[PDB]
C-alpha cells in the first residue's frame, strides 16, 4: 500500500496518454535514473513535454466551425460546435453492406 | 452471502446493559464479603 500524490500521477498519465512516453516509475532498491519509457525517441525529440505543460505545437488543429450567436433560431452549436473537417453520415462501404446483408442471410 | 431479509424482532431494542451498581451487589463487594 504505497502512498503517493496524485496531481503528478495525473500529469504522468496525461503525458503517457497523449505524447506516448512516460517517466519510468519503477521504485527499485537499485537506484535507476529518471528515464523516458514508452515512445523513447519521441520523448527525446520532443524534450519530454507533458500533455499538461505548455509548449509550442504547430500541429494542425482539426478544422472546426464557429456559430456563437444565440440569437439565431437554428444557430447555436456554441460549445457543441462540430469540427468542420468531419463527415455528415458515417456510412460503411457498400461492399461490407452487401456482404452484411448476405451474412444475415447466411445465419 | 449475507441476505437483506430481516425481522420485526431484530429491530434495535434494549441497547444499554444495566450494570450492577454499587448498592445492589457489585463484584467489588463480592471481592470483600465474608
Amino acid at each position: 500500500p504505497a502512498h503517493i500524490n496524485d496531481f503528478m500521477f495525473e500529469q504522468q498519465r496525461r503525458t503517457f496518454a497523449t505524447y506516448g512516453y512516460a517517466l519510468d516509475p519503477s521504485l527499485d532498491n537499485h537506484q535507476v535514473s529518471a528515464k523516458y519509457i514508452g515512445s523513447v525517441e519521441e520523448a527525446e525529440k520532443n524534450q519530454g513535454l507533458t500533455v499538461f505543460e505548455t509548449g509550442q505545437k504547430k500541429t494542425e488543429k482539426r478544422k472546426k466551425f464557429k456559430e456563437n450567436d444565440a440569437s439565431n433560431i437554428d444557430g447555436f452549436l456554441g460549445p457543441w460546435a462540430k469540427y468542420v473537417d468531419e463527415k455528415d453520415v458515417a456510412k460503411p462501404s457498400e461492399e461490407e453492406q452487401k456482404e452484411l446483408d448476405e451474412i444475415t442471410a447466411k445465419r | 452471502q449475507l441476505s437483506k431479509q430481516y425481522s420485526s424482532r431484530d429491530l434495535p431494542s434494549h441497547t444499554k446493559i444495566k450494570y450492577r451498581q454499587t448498592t445492589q451487589d457489585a463484584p467489588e463487594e463480592v471481592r470483600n464479603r465474608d
Partner: protein
C-alpha cells in the same frame, strides 16, 4: 473484547439492512510488483 465487538457490529449492521450508507472512502494507491519481468511488457518498467 475488541475483535468480538468489531465482528458483532458488522453482523448487527447486517440487521440494519437500510444502510444509511457512508460515502466512498479515500482512493487507493497501491504499488504492484509483477512477477512477470521483461523489457517488452509494461513497456519496460519493473513496477506499476
Amino acid at each position: 473484547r475488541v475483535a468480538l465487538e468489531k465482528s458483532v457490529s458488522q453482523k448487527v449492521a447486517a440487521a440494519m439492512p437500510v444502510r444509511a450508507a457512508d460515502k466512498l472512502a479515500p482512493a487507493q494507491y497501491i504499488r504492484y510488483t509483477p512477477s512477470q519481468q521483461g523489457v517488452a511488457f509494461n513497456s519496460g518498467a519493473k513496477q506499476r
